[PDB]
Design a protein around this nucleic acid. Sequence first.
RNA 1: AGGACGACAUUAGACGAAUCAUCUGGAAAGAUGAAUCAAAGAAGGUAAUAAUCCUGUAGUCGAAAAUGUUGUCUCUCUUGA
RNA 2: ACCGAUAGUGAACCAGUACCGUGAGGGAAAGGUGAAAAGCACCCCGGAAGGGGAGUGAAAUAGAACCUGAAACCGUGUGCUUACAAGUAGUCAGAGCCCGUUAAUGGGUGAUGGCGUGCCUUUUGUAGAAUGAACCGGCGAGUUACGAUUUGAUGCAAGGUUAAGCAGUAAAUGUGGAGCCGUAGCGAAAGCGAGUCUGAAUAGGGCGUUUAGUAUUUGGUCGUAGACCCGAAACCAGGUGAU
RNA 3: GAGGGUAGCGGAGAAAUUCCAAUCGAACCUGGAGAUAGCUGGUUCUCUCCGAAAUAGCUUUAGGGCUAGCCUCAAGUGAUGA
RNA 4: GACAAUGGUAGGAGAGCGUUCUAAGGGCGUUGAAGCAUGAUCGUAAGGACAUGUGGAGCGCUUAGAAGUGAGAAUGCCGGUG
RNA 5: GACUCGGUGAAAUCAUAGUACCUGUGAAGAUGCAGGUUACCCGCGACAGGACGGAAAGACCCCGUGGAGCUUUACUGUAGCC
Lengths: 45, 65, 127
Amino acid sequence: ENEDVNVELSARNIPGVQVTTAQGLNVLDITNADSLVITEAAAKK
Amino acid sequence: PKMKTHRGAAKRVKRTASGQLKRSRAFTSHLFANKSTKQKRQLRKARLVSKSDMKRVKQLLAYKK
Amino acid sequence: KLHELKPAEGSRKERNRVGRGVATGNGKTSGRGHKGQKARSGGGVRPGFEGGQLPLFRRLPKRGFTNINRKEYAIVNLDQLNKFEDGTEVTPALLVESGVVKNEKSGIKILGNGSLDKKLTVKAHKF
RNA sequence: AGGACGACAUUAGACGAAUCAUCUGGAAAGAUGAAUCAAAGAAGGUAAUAAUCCUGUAGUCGAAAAUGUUGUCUCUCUUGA
RNA sequence: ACCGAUAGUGAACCAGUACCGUGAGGGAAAGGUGAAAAGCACCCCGGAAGGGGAGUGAAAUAGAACCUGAAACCGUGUGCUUACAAGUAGUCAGAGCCCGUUAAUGGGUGAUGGCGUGCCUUUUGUAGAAUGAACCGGCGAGUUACGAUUUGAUGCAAGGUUAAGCAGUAAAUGUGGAGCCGUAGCGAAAGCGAGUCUGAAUAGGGCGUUUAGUAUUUGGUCGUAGACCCGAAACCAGGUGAU
RNA sequence: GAGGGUAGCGGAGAAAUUCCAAUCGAACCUGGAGAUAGCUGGUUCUCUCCGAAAUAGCUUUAGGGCUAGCCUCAAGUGAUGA
RNA sequence: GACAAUGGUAGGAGAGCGUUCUAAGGGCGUUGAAGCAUGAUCGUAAGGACAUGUGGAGCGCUUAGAAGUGAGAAUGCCGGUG
RNA sequence: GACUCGGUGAAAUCAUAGUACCUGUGAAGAUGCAGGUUACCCGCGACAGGACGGAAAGACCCCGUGGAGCUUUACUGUAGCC
Ligand SMILES: [Mg+2]
Ligand SMILES: [Mg+2]
Ligand SMILES: [Mg+2]
Ligand SMILES: [Mg+2]
Ligand SMILES: [Mg+2]
Ligand SMILES: [Mg+2]
Ligand SMILES: [Mg+2]
Ligand SMILES: [Mg+2]
Ligand SMILES: [Mg+2]
Ligand SMILES: [Mg+2]
Ligand SMILES: [Mg+2]
Ligand SMILES: [Mg+2]
Ligand SMILES: [Mg+2]
Ligand SMILES: [Mg+2]
Ligand SMILES: [Mg+2]
Ligand SMILES: [Mg+2]
Ligand SMILES: [Mg+2]
Ligand SMILES: [Mg+2]
Ligand SMILES: [Mg+2]
Ligand SMILES: [Mg+2]
Ligand SMILES: [Mg+2]
Ligand SMILES: [Mg+2]
Ligand SMILES: [Mg+2]
Ligand SMILES: [Mg+2]
Ligand SMILES: [Mg+2]
Ligand SMILES: [Mg+2]
Ligand SMILES: [Mg+2]
Ligand SMILES: [Mn+2]
Ligand SMILES: [Mn+2]
Ligand SMILES: [Mn+2]
Ligand SMILES: [Mn+2]
Ligand SMILES: [Mn+2]
Ligand SMILES: [Mn+2]
Ligand SMILES: [Mn+2]
Ligand SMILES: [Mn+2]
Ligand SMILES: [Mn+2]
Ligand SMILES: [Mn+2]
Ligand SMILES: [Mn+2]
Ligand SMILES: [Mn+2]
Ligand SMILES: [Mn+2]
Ligand SMILES: [Mn+2]
Ligand SMILES: [Mn+2]
Ligand SMILES: [Mn+2]
Ligand SMILES: [Mn+2]
Ligand SMILES: [Mn+2]
Ligand SMILES: [Mn+2]
Ligand SMILES: [Mn+2]
Ligand SMILES: [Mn+2]
Ligand SMILES: [Mn+2]
Ligand SMILES: [Mn+2]
Ligand SMILES: [Mn+2]
Ligand SMILES: [Mn+2]
Ligand SMILES: [Mn+2]
Ligand SMILES: [Mn+2]
Ligand SMILES: [Mn+2]
Ligand SMILES: [Mn+2]
Ligand SMILES: [Mn+2]
Ligand SMILES: [Mn+2]
Ligand SMILES: [Mn+2]
Ligand SMILES: [Mn+2]
Ligand SMILES: [Mn+2]
Ligand SMILES: [Mn+2]
Ligand SMILES: [Mn+2]
Ligand SMILES: [Mn+2]
Ligand SMILES: [Mn+2]
Ligand SMILES: [Mn+2]
Ligand SMILES: [Mn+2]
Ligand SMILES: [Mn+2]
Ligand SMILES: [Mn+2]
Ligand SMILES: [Mn+2]
Ligand SMILES: [Mn+2]
Ligand SMILES: [Mn+2]
Ligand SMILES: [Mn+2]
Ligand SMILES: [Mn+2]
Ligand SMILES: [Mn+2]
Ligand SMILES: [Mn+2]
Ligand SMILES: [Mn+2]
Ligand SMILES: [Mn+2]
Ligand SMILES: [Mn+2]
Ligand SMILES: [Mn+2]
Ligand SMILES: [Mn+2]
């Protein structure tokens, strides 16, 4: 769902399990499918 | 490389304590009957490595306890 | 905030660069301030040790677990998936007293001062 | 213990998306004013710094032959508790 | 988060080449016009070299030994100064003359007066007649790995924590709890245990008990490594030489 | 004179430690190799606070080293210091 | 606001200046970057700007990271020139 | 040969140099320090008292738990031999 590799800026997209501290710091906004956000909330606890 | 332990000292240290090396004591081998019975009986009981020497020998027994 | 980072105050200090100008430009002055300056650490120019040696080491040595066993209100033991012993070679149960609950202890070699209390609230001994 | 069938691969290659005007100027890719593409905003080249100028890139096909490579037939070899 | 022409290969260039040695063998230096050769037709002084024009060019005050073009060094011009004076050359004071700035209780020079024996090293002590440097530029010495210890920071905490390995995009991370350290110490040891050892002793005395660790990491220091850098006379091993 | 032979733990020497490709009490070249060097030399920016020692003890030690002493930085004790 | 301390070799401790690379942010640049030259500029120092000439592509600022990070001396190496 | 002219044109050395003498001073033998004395500025031809002149990290002497070569009833070994 990431044939947005090629956008200026804004072109990191990874599974909520491939998530890294770089982006989430680097990037000044972040957008989340639910269930993706659920999968984080599962692991983070 | 891991620092090697001076095993010749470790054969004469015994660590334990709160970090102090234990003892072993000198003139305790042979050639008695020139030491006093007083000297003889007292060199039998053992005493630690001295503050000044633990300053020098600190590295060799780094792995003891 | 990726362009305005800051490390926790107290970590990190600029390492010392000897020999780079005249806010100190050296080390010592002669003797063994020669490169790879010796003295063995130990070799203080006459024995140092050379004074007795007492030795052995053999075999069997247990693994202690003191009577700070405020576990459940009963049940058996040696079960240490529970957060107690780990890396055991045997399992003696010692003292520092507070048999505040009643249970059945089980491990090899129990200490007499301990087992007197473990058996004075629920009874417990084994191999 | 040596050889007969057709898939992939190696050794040439092909397709490949989308820009104009102006100011400065030796020259525009820069600035600016309107655009467009994008599974392609990697990179290098072009009279200065170019996703849209060129070689390319993502991507898609491509082998006469030659090796290499295997699925499978055959091929041997088979008496097994 | 490797070099960018003394760096990086010895070698960005026709390098194992000029070059040196009988030989084995040793072994350099040396990149860059411009966008485009449009590389200066033509006149001019000169045998030529080289040059003044005219020209191409954005630029040749980019013209080939060609981007930039520092310093030592060499010269031309000249504003202040200098031929009765003994000088580590400056500093402090200061007339005269000349100029006019990042405009500020300005700049250049300096009759004359006070003061005043370079630097480095090494030294009890060096102006030293002890050492070093002709000058200018470039290059030129405390590093990293892995262990140790200590400090500081952060996370958890009676716990703390993973290694290889798989997974992944040469990550982070997920995994993986073998393992290591800690919660208990004492004794050479059998061993006993908040106590143990010696001891014949429930005397005394040693070590310990009363409570905090552990993982990563910045710093300091040590150890293993060439371990801050340069420097021997020598030793051994293979070879090469009686021109 | 020309063609040859003996080679470095070796060779040759009417003999001097003499010769072995312009210095031979042991040739040259490449490697081990960054031999080792308690010796000498060198070691590159700035300011701020403190600030020594050239003594004792032992040392095949004596211009080297170790521990002590004296310096610093940090914790702690808390009038022990003058 | 008073009041104190502030010479200093080896040496300990501290705070900083600058160099190259990286990251993110925010910028400058053929209406002229770095570099070079000049100045009577600013800061307690290391050092920082600005103006002009040169020059003809690039480069800085902030925060943090990492270092082949700073030269006047080694009868230092290499070049150039006395 | 030197010397003058035409031609060509090195070198060792060299911290910067506007580089006097006396009596002193001083790391105890001073162009450079003190106090006096003396001296206009710049060459050239000469001479060697000084610059502890240049040259070579003193061959003497000592030192280093450096080297090498050599000797022996130094020690430990070994080719060989009975
Ligand atoms: Mg993509
Ligand atoms: Mg033990
Ligand atoms: Mg003792
Ligand atoms: Mg243009
Ligand atoms: Mg545009
Ligand atoms: Mg270009
Ligand atoms: Mg002509
Ligand atoms: Mg250029
Ligand atoms: Mg010049
Ligand atoms: Mg002396
Ligand atoms: Mg001198
Ligand atoms: Mg706690
Ligand atoms: Mg006791
Ligand atoms: Mg006790
Ligand atoms: Mg040999
Ligand atoms: Mg001779
Ligand atoms: Mg030769
Ligand atoms: Mg030799
Ligand atoms: Mg003395
Ligand atoms: Mg004294
Ligand atoms: Mg212009
Ligand atoms: Mg004549
Ligand atoms: Mg000089
Ligand atoms: Mg004179
Ligand atoms: Mg001689
Ligand atoms: Mg002699
Ligand atoms: Mg000697
Ligand atoms: Mn051992
Ligand atoms: Mn021992
Ligand atoms: Mn005995
Ligand atoms: Mn006696
Ligand atoms: Mn610092
Ligand atoms: Mn020195
Ligand atoms: Mn020393
Ligand atoms: Mn040192
Ligand atoms: Mn060395
Ligand atoms: Mn195409
Ligand atoms: Mn295209
Ligand atoms: Mn255009
Ligand atoms: Mn493709
Ligand atoms: Mn260059
Ligand atoms: Mn030749
Ligand atoms: Mn070109
Ligand atoms: Mn001509
Ligand atoms: Mn023109
Ligand atoms: Mn030139
Ligand atoms: Mn040029
Ligand atoms: Mn006069
Ligand atoms: Mn006059
Ligand atoms: Mn005088
Ligand atoms: Mn004066
Ligand atoms: Mn004076
Ligand atoms: Mn220095
Ligand atoms: Mn002199
Ligand atoms: Mn000397
Ligand atoms: Mn000299
Ligand atoms: Mn130099
Ligand atoms: Mn130390
Ligand atoms: Mn070191
Ligand atoms: Mn002869
Ligand atoms: Mn000869
Ligand atoms: Mn070796
Ligand atoms: Mn060496
Ligand atoms: Mn002070
Ligand atoms: Mn000394
Ligand atoms: Mn205190
Ligand atoms: Mn008192
Ligand atoms: Mn001070
Ligand atoms: Mn003072
Ligand atoms: Mn100091
Ligand atoms: Mn320090
Ligand atoms: Mn800028
Ligand atoms: Mn740069
Ligand atoms: Mn450097
Ligand atoms: Mn030179
Ligand atoms: Mn002449
Ligand atoms: Mn003096
Ligand atoms: Mn005197
Ligand atoms: Mn003369
Ligand atoms: Mn003469
Ligand atoms: Mn000498």
